[PDB]
Every structure is written in C-alpha cells, then in structure tokens.
C-alpha cells in the first residue's frame, strides 16, 4: 500500500515544462513590453528574469534532495519553520490558491476550444462553464483510475504544446531570414530607463516563470530522487527560457508594437496574419496547453493534500489509498469538488489579485528556511550542497517580489493576509489541542462518515 515510485525523469521533465508554459506566453506576453516601450530592452528583461528564476530552481533542487518529502513548500516550511506556519500555508492553498488556479485554467480552455466558431464576438457564458466542468470531471477520473494514465496524458499534451510553439518560432525565424529584418533595425530606441519602469518590467517577467517547482510536490514517488530530481529541474529550466525568448522574437518580428500592445490574444493575431489558412491551429494549440496545465495542477494539489492530512492538520481521512490501484482517491475527489464549486462564481478572473503577495511570501519563506537549516544543523547528510550564493540572490529577489505588491494595491494584499490568517481558529481549537479532549460527538460522526466513504471507495490508509 506504499505509493508507487513510478515517477520517471521524462515524466518529471514533462511536469515541469508542461506546467510552466501555459497561456502566459500565448495570450499575454505584453507585460514586459508595455513598461519598456522598446523591443531590445524587452528581450533583455526576459533573459534577466529567466536567469533569476533558474537560480531559484537550483535552490529548490537542493531543498528537495535534502529533505525528500512531498509537499514542496509545506514539508520544508514545516521541518524548518514549524507546523502552525505550515498550517497557514496549507490553509491558504486549500482555500484560495489551488481551486482558483484550476478553475481559471479550465475556463480558459473552454474559452479557446470554441473560439473559431465565434471569432470576433464573445462566446456564450453557459457553454463556457459547462465545458469547464466537463473538463475537470474528465481529468479527475483519468487520475483516479491509475497513475500511468496521468503521466500518459501529461506526455501527450506537453508534446503537443511544444510542437506548436516550435511551429511559431520556426515560421517567425523563417520570416526574419527572408531578407526583411525589418522591425530589428533601430532597436532600443525610446526605451524607458527609469527605475520605476525596470522594476515593473522585472516583476512582470518574474510572474511569467511561476511554476518551476511542480515536480517537488511528488518527490516521494520519483524512482530515485537523488538523480532524477536535480537533473529534471536543470534540464527543464533552459528549455523554457529559450522557448520564451525565441517566441518573443517571433512576435516582435511579424507584428508591430501598435497592436501587440493592444491585441487581446497575441498568438491568434499572429496566426491570422501569417498562416493564410490554418488560422484555427493556434487556438486549438492553446486549448491543448491549457488541458495539460490543468492536469499537472491536479497532480500536485492532490499530493499536497495527501501529505497535509498525513501530518494531522487535515481530517484523518484524506490519507487513504486504493487497494488494487494505489491512487489517493479521496484527495483527488476533494480537489475536484473544490474546483467545481469555484466555477460557480461569476468573474473569478479578479481573485488572482488576492493572493499575489501570499504565494511569493511562502516561496521566500521556504528559501530562508533552507538558510536557517544550513546554519542550525549543518551535519545532516546532504547529497548535493550548493554555495550560499544562490539562496542569497533569490531571497533578495523574493524580498523584491513581496515588496512590489504591498506598496501598490495595498488593500488587496491586506485582504489576502486576512484570508490567509482566517484559519487560525481551527488550528488553536481543534488541531494543537491534543487527542481525547475534543467533544466525543464530532469524533464519533467523523469516524462514522470515514468508514462510510472508506467502504465506498476501497481505501485503507498507508501501511
């Protein structure tokens, strides 16, 4: 009843890549450009953001191979900076960070699957919500059946999205070699060399690489983590940096700045421009990218809730496993149910502002916890130990990334801290308080429904 260590290097490369490259490059690559007002300076800020995130990813390779526990920001914060702190992390990612991510990726998939039929106008609302709910249900089933099914889906759809991006890059660079070299003649001109603009360029190019640790959430299942984890992160960082910069070169080569800065889906405009026919290949490619991203998010979130309940911070129940299949069925059903609730809210696209301070606070806290463990107990067996250079530069960068969204837009980050902190009563009244002191009614009904769903789902907790 152990959890099969079936995770492979390839499958790991696929998780990291196919979760980084989503719709952050297909439908909104105009974060750097608007605050930079030039071309060459935008490519340069892309490269710099890529370098800083590479350093961060090597820092997490070090952590993940030091501790070797799933959770990927919760096990480390726990072992290093406590369980209450760990419980704050689990509570925020239970309540608002994961369900909104999955709901929005499903909604965007739905938006972009039917777009060729509604090219200029807005596709309906009922149909978008129904296709999103159908997608989430299908993926939670595919992942509650086996685990090799989850990995085959991941491989297929990462291959698809990457071959589509290769199409875009090669067609752009075959345009750039047809003798035109047209927009690239007087680059760098008109740039905004203010500090108050390079700061926003860096911030918007550091939100574009978020997701570089989706392979740490499954560390307990990789074949032998000491070789497959750091190699997977080191092999999945430069691929994404190169594809980002080359796709940006393709965009800036074909279109000009007057519409790339005012286009609502830059890939679709590119397809309308160059591909005479086949203006429908790129929308379907964006739909496939979204489907793969959603699958990887379901993977990581199910494993995080699994660990959380295995620690006692959640019900004793989510730590079950299927007898004949070895898949955390109750955790996946719980995650699906939360996402299918959050689909019901109109205009969820706002909620991505209420946690843009929390998330990077937690990443930075995990890094400084690595520093604290490097100081306090320096005699643990560390298979690979890095110079303190990389945690230094990335903790600096995390100070930067938490300080930007507090000065501006303070009320949103403040209500975010309100949500994140809304979980301490449960802790202080039910969790930190020991066993056998709680009212007996709640324990009785809990165990009764536990046995109910257990017999219903064929799941006995880990051996």
């Amino acid at each position: 009843m152990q959890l099969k260590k079936e995770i492979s290097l390839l499958n790991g490369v696929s998780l990291v890549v196919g979760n980084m490259i989503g719709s952050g490059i297909f439908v909104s690559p105009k974060g750097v450009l608007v605050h930079t007002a030039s071309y060459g300076m935008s490519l340069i800020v892309w490269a710099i953001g890529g370098l800083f995130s590479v350093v961060g990813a090597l820092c997490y390779a070090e952590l993940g191979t030091t501790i070797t526990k799933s959770g990927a920001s919760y096990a480390y914060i726990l072992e290093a900076f406590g369980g209450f702190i760990a419980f704050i992390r689990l509570w925020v990612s239970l309540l608002v960070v994961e369900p909104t991510g999955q709901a929005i990726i499903a909604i965007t998939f739905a938006n972009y699957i039917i777009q060729p039929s509604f090219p200029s106008c807005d596709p309906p609302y009922l149909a978008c919500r129904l296709l999103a709910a159908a997608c989430i249900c299908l993926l939670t089933f595919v992942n509650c059946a086996y685990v090799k099914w989850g990995t085959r889906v991941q491989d297929t759809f990462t291959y698809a999205k990457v071959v589509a991006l290769i199409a875009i890059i090669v067609m752009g660079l075959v345009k750039l070699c047809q003798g035109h070299s047209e927009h690239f003649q007087d680059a760098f001109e008109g740039s905004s060399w203010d500090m108050g603009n390079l700061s926003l360029a860096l911030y918007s190019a550091l939100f574009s690489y978020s997701g570089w640790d989706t392979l740490n959430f499954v560390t307990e299942e990789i074949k032998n983590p000491e070789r497959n984890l750091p190699l997977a992160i080191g092999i999945s960082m430069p691929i994404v940096t190169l594809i980002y910069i080359l796709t940006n070169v393709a965009y800036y080569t074909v279109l000009n700045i007057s519409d790339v800065l005012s286009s609502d889906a830059v890939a679709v405009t590119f397809a309308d421009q160059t591909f005479g026919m086949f203006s429908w290949t790129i929308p379907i490619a964006v739909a496939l990218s979204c489907f793969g991203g959603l699958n990887a998010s379901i993977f990581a979130s199910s494993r995080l809730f699994f660990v959380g309940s295995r620690e006692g911070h959640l019900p004793d129940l989510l730590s079950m496993i299927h007898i004949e299949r070895f898949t955390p069925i109750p955790a996946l059903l719980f995650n699906c149910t939360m996402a299918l609730i959050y689909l019901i809210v109109e205009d969820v696209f706002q909620l991505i502002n209420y946690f843009s301070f929390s998330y990077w606070f937690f990443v930075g806290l995990s890094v400084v916890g690595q520093l604290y463990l490097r100081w306090k107990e320096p005699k643990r067996p560390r298979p690979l130990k890095l110079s303190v250079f990389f945690p230094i530069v990335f903790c600096i960068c995390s100070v930067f990334l938490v300080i930007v969204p507090l000065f501006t837009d303070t009320i949103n980050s403040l209500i975010g801290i309100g949500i994140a902190l809304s979980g301490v009563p449960f802790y202080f009244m039910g969790v930190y308080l020991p066993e056998s002191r709680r009212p007996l009614f709640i324990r009785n009904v809990l165990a009764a429904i536990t046995r109910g769903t257990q017999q219903l789902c064929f799941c006995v907790l880990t051996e």
Binding site: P124, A447, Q454, L456
Partner: protein
Amino acid sequence: KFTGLSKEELLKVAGSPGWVRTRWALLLLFWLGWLGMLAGAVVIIVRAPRCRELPAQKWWHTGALYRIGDLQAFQGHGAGNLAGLKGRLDYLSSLKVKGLVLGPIHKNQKDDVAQTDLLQIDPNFGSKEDFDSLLQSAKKKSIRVILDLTPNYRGENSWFSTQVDTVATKVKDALEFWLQAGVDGFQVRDIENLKDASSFLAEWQNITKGFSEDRLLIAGTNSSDLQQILSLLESNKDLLLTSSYLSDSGSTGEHTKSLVTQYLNATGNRWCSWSLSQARLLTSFLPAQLLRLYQLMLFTLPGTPVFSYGDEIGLDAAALPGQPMEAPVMLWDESSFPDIPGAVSANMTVKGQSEDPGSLLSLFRRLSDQRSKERSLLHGDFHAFSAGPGLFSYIRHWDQNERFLVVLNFGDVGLSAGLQASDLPASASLPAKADLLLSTQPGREEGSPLELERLKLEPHEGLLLRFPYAA
C-alpha cells in the same frame, strides 16, 4: 477511535451486494451526468447567434488624417526641412494621426507649365535621401504619408491653367514615379477649376487601384451644393471628396442633423470624408467656445476626419498678428514665435496644455484614441434619432462591442437632454442607465453611471454616454 476499516476487514465488509451495486450505480450515474453536461453545452452553442463579418478595412478607414499647408510654417522655422519633421513625426503620433498629408513638396517656380516638374523635391525642403528616410521612420511608427500633387501651389490655380491638362499627364507619370518611391496615396485640390474632371478621376482611381489595393486618392473642392457633389460621386466610389458642405455658422441642432442625414441618404450610407474646408482651419468660421463641439462631432461621424495643422490646439490666426492667416505658425513653446513676445499665453501652446486635463489638446488625444481603438466607432452603424429643439444626437453600435452614444447641443441655452427615439433596432435597444466617458466643459466625473432619462444639458455640452451589449 474507529480508525476506519482495516485492509482485510475492509475486504470482508465489502462482500455485501448492496455496496457493490451502489458502486456500480454511482459510476453509471457519473458517466450519464457528464454526457448530459456535454450535450447541454453543445445544444446551447447551436442555439446561439452567429455574428457579423469584418468589413475588411483599409488603413485610412481608421482614425484621422492630418493636412499640412506649408512645411516651413509647421515646425515654426524658416527652413523647409524634412529633417525638421523628424522632430514632428513624434508630435503627429502624439496626436495619434492615422495618416498624413504633406504639402506640395515638388518644385514650383511660376505659371510655366513645363518647368514645374513633380519628380524632384525642392532643395529648401530637403533631398531624396532624407525624404526616403522620413518614409522609413514614418513606416516604423505606422504613419503612412500621402503626397500632395497639386501642381501650382504658388499661383491662383493649382493646374497653372483652368483649361489645359497636360499637367494631368504629369500627374499620371508622377504617380508611378512616387509609387516606386514609396508614397501611400495622392491628393489633388481645386477640382472645380479642372475641366473634364470625372474622366481624369476615373482614370487615376483605376491606375491607383492597379498599383495596389491600399493606394488612395483624395479630391478637394470648395463647392457647397449637394448636386455638384452627387454628380462628382457618380462613377467611382473610392474617391474621398472634401468640400465646404458642413460649414454652417448657424448650424442649428436641427440644421446640422438635416445636412448630415441628407448627405448620407443621398449615398446610401457609403464611406465619405468629414471636414469643413479644403485648406482652411476650423477657427476660420467658428468662435472659441465651439471648437470642442466640432472636435467631438467630426471624430464620431462615419468617415475619415480630415484636419488641418494647428487645429489640435485651437490655433487662431486672428488673435496672433503679423502672419498670413493661410500659413500660421505652430506655438510649440512661448518662444516658438520670436516676434512680439508676451503676445502668447500658456493656454495657447502645446506644453501648457499637455498637463492640463481640461485643455483642448487633451480632448484631441482622448478622442483620437477612442476612435482609433474601438470597433463601434471604426466601422459601426450610424443612427440619429429626433431630439429636443436644437439637439443633435446619434448612436454607434457594431455587433456586440461597447456601444457609443453622443449628445450634442448647437445652442447657447441650457436644455433638458431628453432622449426619446422609440425607433432603435432590437440589438440597439437603449437602456435606462449607462456610464460616461467625458464632456466638453467640466462639471461631472468619469466612470460614474448616469441614468438615461433625466439628463441636464448646459449650453455647448457634448457627452459620451456608453452602454454595453445586451439583448
């Protein structure tokens, strides 16, 4: 204390037929519900209205155009200088101009018909190389340059003669020359003074469309009767004709409405050009308290708004002395005009008006942006309904994008802005509440939702009430 079910124990308790039947039933029910959700989605999609086609626009169908009388009087300098424009291209882009009309930069000496040749640029303005550099820099910022092909811009007539038309042959070969040079159109004026017009217009239109699809020809006349216009717009319909048709001092609210709607009904809502005159500025006919009225009108009618240089600041050639009214000077700064200092104020330049939110040039920039980005203004449909005594009001709605509505008063009196139409189409049903974008004179705030029944209207007020798509 229950600790749920043991693995083996679980296997023992799972033998009851009830639980296995319940499991099978729940799986069956899940698949039924998922297929039903797909079917509902597809049904709802099929019961949804397909929506209209993009009319495949050219470049000039977007935004505004910008005329230029004399290049030296533009930068404020006595040296004609294409290189001098290098510091004005930006400014034009600041006004967000979708196009440009250079003055006649060819050589022009005197009434001689042969010595004036349209193939060489006057050295006082520049050369060929800096000219092509101007073209390339403009194309880098998307400012396509139309060349002024009126031959005699230093005489009483443009053709050196009312009768002879070998200058027309000069036009023909100049077309191919400058098109291999890289111009994006041509414009000729004083058409009422050229005989055998329609044939030349047809031939030039045909050859210009034969060179490309996006090459444009603009004719300009000082006519004022609808019959001459309709007679000139008989053969070819890509001809954009600028006339003095709209120049009305009284321009009562029901007068401008009548004029515009008759002009449109004569042509069945085709494409046209909206400007007061061929080469005069707006202020040459209007007072200072109506410039915002007209600059809000001409940026919303279904056409391409042709502007002469200096009308984005409200430049007036009657207050500034010591200059021919046809060729004023642009007041870049208070020292741009060296002669007679102190005569210029802060509200009469570009810098003193750039930061003023309630200035005139800010109105120009806001209007040009809203007209060069919104679909409902680009190619939307036009419908003007009757209103109060001296009011002009219409709507702009394309298919499903943000509708636009304007309220315009050609009166020095305050009126209650009652909007009673009862004829709007089903997809353009006027709601009772809509937002607001801006007004001519201050007094209200943007983003505030106003209810569309009890609107107060002060003298010379223009509004931009906006209501989104609905049933």
